Design a protein around this ligand. Structure first.
Ligand SMILES: CCCCCCCCCCCCCCCCCC(=O)OC[C@H](COP(=O)([O-])OC[C@H](O)COP(=O)([O-])OC[C@H](COC(=O)CCCCCCCCCCCCCCCCC)OC(=O)CCCCCCCCCCCCCCCCC)OC(=O)CCCCCCCCCCCCCCCCC
Lengths: 63, 57
């Protein structure tokens, strides 16, 4: 191969791998923040559905 | 002149005209927490694949 070909192919390799490494670091930071705060879509552990609640007038009023 | 109610009448659900206001918060509840932000936007492919150590897809 030409030195030009090896050179610019190396530059394409380095761009792809440095982008993947920066995305992995951001992935770790996103996971840490979402586990710590619970405000993203990950680590959304379930709670009770409020659509199960009966809101009808019951037998006794103090409720 | 009072007429005794028939079978079924005293168990009816009646309507009541009042002058007191309807309670806006009968449970004395505070404000609910704001929900988590939803998903929006188109779903793009994963940038350079799985990014699992050496797999290019
Ligand atoms: C117009 C419409 C139609 C268009 C058609 C266009 C195509 C026309 C040709 C049609 C045929 C296409 C075939 C698939 C494309 C080439 C795939 C390829 O070589 O990937 C290179 C892949 C990465 O190299 P690359 O230079 O970065 O990529 C070049 C391409 O861009 C590769 O592209 P990529 O980067 O996008 O690839 C994605 C990713 C690229 O890979 C990666 O990102 C790296 C991770 C790969 C897996 C590493 C696992 C490590 C631990 C396990 C080690 C395995 C043990 C070794 C084998 C044991 C004995 C079988 O692949 C994978 O992750 C898939 C896993 C590997 C399977 C590859 C395909 C195998 C098909 C036949 C299987 C036969 C057995 C093969 C050996 C079994 C093990 C592979 O090479 C390796 O990982 C080396 C291992 C060997 C790969 C298999 C070679 C396929 C041809 C075998 C023929 C001879 C068989 C002899 C008999 C059986 C064995 C005894």
């Amino acid at each position: 191969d030409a030195p030009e070909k090896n050179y610019e192919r190396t530059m394409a390799i380095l761009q792809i791998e440095s982008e993947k490494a920066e995305l992995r670091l951001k992935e770790l930071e996103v996971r840490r923040l979402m586990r710590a705060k619970g405000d993203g879509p990950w680590f959304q552990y379930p709670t009770i559905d409020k659509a199960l609640i009966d809101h009808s007038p019951k037998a006794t009023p103090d409720n | 002149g009072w007429v005794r109610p028939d079978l079924g009448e005293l168990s009816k659900v009646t309507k009541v005209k009042t002058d007191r206001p309807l309670p806006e918060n009968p449970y004395h509840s505070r404000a609910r927490p704001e929900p988590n932000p939803e998903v929006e936007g188109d779903l793009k492919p994963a940038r350079h694949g799985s990014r699992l150590f050496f797999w290019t897809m």
